[PDB]
Amino acid sequence: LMQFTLPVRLCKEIELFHFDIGPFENMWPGIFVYMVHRSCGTSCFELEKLCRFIMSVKKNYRRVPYHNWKHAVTVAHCMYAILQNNHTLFTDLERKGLLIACLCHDLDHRGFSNSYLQKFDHPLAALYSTSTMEQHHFSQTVSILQLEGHNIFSTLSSSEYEQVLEIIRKAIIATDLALYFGNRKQLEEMYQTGSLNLNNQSHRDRVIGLMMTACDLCSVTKLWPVTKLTANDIYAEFWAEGDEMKKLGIQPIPMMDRDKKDEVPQGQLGFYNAVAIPCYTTLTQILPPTEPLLKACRDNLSQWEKVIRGEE
Numbered sequence: 001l002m003q004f005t006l007p008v009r010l011c012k013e014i015e016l017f018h019f020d021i022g023p024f025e026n027m028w029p030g031i032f033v034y035m036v037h038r039s040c041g042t043s044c045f046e047l048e049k050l051c052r053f054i055m056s057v058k059k060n061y062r063r064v065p066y067h068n069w070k071h072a073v074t075v076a077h078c079m080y081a082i083l084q085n086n087h088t089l090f091t092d093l094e095r096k097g098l099l100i101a102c103l104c105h106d107l108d109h110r111g112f113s114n115s116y117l118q119k120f121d122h123p124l125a126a127l128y129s130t131s132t133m134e135q136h137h138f139s140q141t142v143s144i145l146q147l148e149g150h151n152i153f154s155t156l157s158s159s160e161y162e163q164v165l166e167i168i169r170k171a172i173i174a175t176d177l178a179l180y181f182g183n184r185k186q187l188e189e190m191y192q193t194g195s196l197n198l199n200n201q202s203h204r205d206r207v208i209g210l211m212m213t214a215c216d217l218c219s220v221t222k223l224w225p226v227t228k229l230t231a232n233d234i235y236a237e238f239w240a241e242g243d244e245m246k247k248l249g250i251q252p253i254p255m256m257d258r259d260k261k262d263e264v265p266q267g268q269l270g271f272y273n274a275v276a277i278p279c280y281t282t283l284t285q286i287l288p289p290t291e292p293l294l295k296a297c298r299d300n301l302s303q304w305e306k307v308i309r310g311e312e
């Protein structure tokens, strides 16, 4: 059969958490199929259906600065790394569902936060009162799965199919950062009181949610030059939102105001300390082989501190 292979540098470095998928768009589908084959098997999906699914997913990502097809694939690679370093903890259905969830988790993203959609009074804010974009991303995932020749799950039973779509829904909902704070707090408590129990479905859900946040934030876990250039894409979306807030007659919060670039370094410190570090710390406590993500994050916090001290 037809094993996808990569050049030697990619074959070795794709196994590492800090891997950057590179600027050759045309290689990213192949990078994804390689990861499915190694974390799932050559059998998980029919190649022709999987290829057709990947290509319609790509088409449904938009040409925005950060929440684009490259982000999709980047987030899926981080899930691949977590799965490969924790071979025996995940069911075959989770292996399958999680890479698809990550490839799909920001489908048809327009570059604007849930909060901007609510203030603009976007139709999606009326259809989905919370996790507005994330409910949209899951809705777009089901759509594509229902196109002719795109059902990559069609060898599963009614009930395996329902389970896998339910893993994908929860995984995508979990990428709403508003929900991450309480999820991590609960997991911190369950880890520390010793009640964390991976046979408890509602515990597993919490642990997959945190993995989803970890993958989603994974630019903070790269080599500093990747982290730093990705930060420019992130703020290029936020500042456009800032502009659109000003057009609605609303002074945007400082992290979205282009006239306050000054405050970016300090806004990065808050983000690493309030969000990223706590995220990878709890993750590393529950899944110890994910420690390199926490180590790379702390490395990047220390680079932002150097930027503040004018050494960078």
Ligand SMILES: Cc1ncc(C)n2nc(CN(C)c3nc(-c4ccccc4)nn3C)nc12
Pocket (backbone or CB within 6 Å): 177, 217, 219, 220, 231, 234, 238, 255, 256, 267, 268, 270, 271, 274, 275
């Ligand atoms: C590198 C990176 N990856 C992903 C995202 C989503 N962001 N967000 C920023 C900076 N910034 C715009 C931001 N700070 C906070 C925050 C700060 C302190 C406390 C709570 C929340 N939320 N947000 C969206 N940097 C990143």
Ligand SMILES: [Mg+2]
Pocket (backbone or CB within 6 Å): 105, 106, 133, 175, 176
């Ligand atoms: Mg998202």
Ligand SMILES: [Zn+2]
Pocket (backbone or CB within 6 Å): 071, 075, 105, 106, 175, 216
């Ligand atoms: Zn995302």
